[model samples]
Target chain A: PTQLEMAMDTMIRIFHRYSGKERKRFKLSKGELKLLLQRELTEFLSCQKETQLVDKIVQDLDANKDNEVDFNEFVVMVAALTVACNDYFVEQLKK
Target chain B: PTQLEMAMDTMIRIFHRYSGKERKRFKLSKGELKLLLQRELTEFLSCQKETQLVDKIVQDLDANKDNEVDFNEFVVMVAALTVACNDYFVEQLKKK
Candidate 1:
């Protein structure tokens, strides 16, 4: 598999591991999501110092208002991050 | 870096490699985009045999209508694929 393939697989694998950290291991709980972000997305979180980042994310992505984030929701966050990163990368190049 | 971080890096790296395959080496031309899907997304492409997939994608994502795919547009395709894969994965698990 190519690096991109592995990257997609990694996203899936990491999601399951973190989401399955507790009882009912299907979706991500608030605490579970926080831990996942703090660990798996270290550099990303470090890029911003918003103490309310986690809760804000939950509020923004809880489009279903279920208080839990499913894989679909999780992917949305990852996709948004990737888009932001790409924008930064492109902007740098264009500068 | 964690596996996830490395994965993100990989995505960025692979895009630059392919998008930089042409004269400008910035955004991806249609041919470059097609070749990217064919080579980089082998498993995902193998899961479906749609001959018109490449052209259809270009048509759909050419929202800016520049005939070229920027990194943002390219990430949209990858995100959609990942979501689809997750849906399939979850469905299969639920069936068990």
Candidate 2:
């Protein structure tokens, strides 16, 4: 498997690995989401330096609002964080 | 770094590794896009069983007709193909 596909599979597996622990692995609850973020996204969260900012991003308000992040929401979170990380990273690269 | 973080960085690196090759590495030309799709995403693309079902896709024609797929557009491609792969994969997993 090439790195790209491998990475995606890794992401799929990781998400399910965390979300699967209790309920349906298809979606993640708040507790599950928190663990997934705090554990799986350690450095990226740390790199942000402000926990409050990261605290509330995963759940979109447009939700049933019940507090579950599905795969789609999870993708949204990753994109946001990646963009944040990349902006900082590319800045560092510029130096 | 968690596997997730590593994967993100790996993705970033892989994209740059290819995009960095030609003019404006930040954006992928047709050749570069094709290469990235063909090489890096071999199974994902092949698993789709398609050729230019790949073609009409990258050219975003919303009356504005974008030239090449940007990062955002590339992300769309990945999401669609990922969903496609997952459907088949999940279907197979269901039988097994």
Candidate 3:
């Protein structure tokens, strides 16, 4: 697979690998998201120190305020996160 | 890096790999986008058979109609495309 294809596949696999841990296999609960962040985002989260980060993320990610994160919501999170990271990278490159 | 981190990094790398092909080095021109689509999306495009796919994608992707695709715009495209693919995957999974 190409790099882009692999990245997309990786995103899907990572989400499902965690989202499948409980009752709803297609959506992520608060607990599921916590585990996902703790495990899959250890490095990314290490840049900060906030105890309520997960809760805040859930609130923000729950666009419909349904308290459950579906695939589309999850995609928005990743896209935003990736863009933020790229913003930092680009700024550094601009120097 | 974790799978998620790797995926994000891969996206950045892939975009720069293409965007750096010309003068801008931070955004993709029409030709750069076309080449990126043809080279990096060979498999994805194989599933599609549209001759004007590249032009259509550039038009749809140019949200601001700036005729240039920046990183944010590129990310949106990837996110939408991934969601489309996942929608298909989920449908298949719902079956036996």
Predicted model with the maximum DockQ = 2
Ten-residue region with minimum lDDT total, candidate 3 chain B: B46-55
Docking class of 3: acceptable
What is the DockQ of the complex in model 3? 0.37
- State which candidate has the highest lDDT: 2
lDDT per residue as tens, model 2, B7-92: 87776676666674445644665556656765776464545454344435433332333245455555556656666655666776
lDDT of 3 by residue, A1-95 (tens): 56788887787687787765444654776556656765776445633333344445645544533367765456556655545543556557657
- The digit string of per-residue lDDT tens for model 1 on B32-64 reads 665676677745553333334443664554453
Ranking by DockQ: 2, 3, 1
Deviation of model 2 at B96, angstroms: 20
| lDDT for each residue of candidate 1 in A2-78, tens digit (9 for 90 to 100) | 57767867876887887654545436765566567667764556344333444466455445343576554565566
On DockQ, the stronger of 2 and 3 is 2
Identify the runs in model 3 with alpha carbons over 4 angstroms from their true place: A20-31, A43-45, A50-95, B20-32, B43-46, B50-76, B79-96
The DockQ scores of all candidates, in the order shown, are 0.32, 0.42, 0.37
- lDDT for B3 in candidate 2 is 73
Q: Report the Cα lDDT for residue B47, model 2.
A: 55
lDDT of 2 by residue, A1-95 (tens): 56777876777787788765556655777666666766777565564554444545633432433466666456556756766655665557657
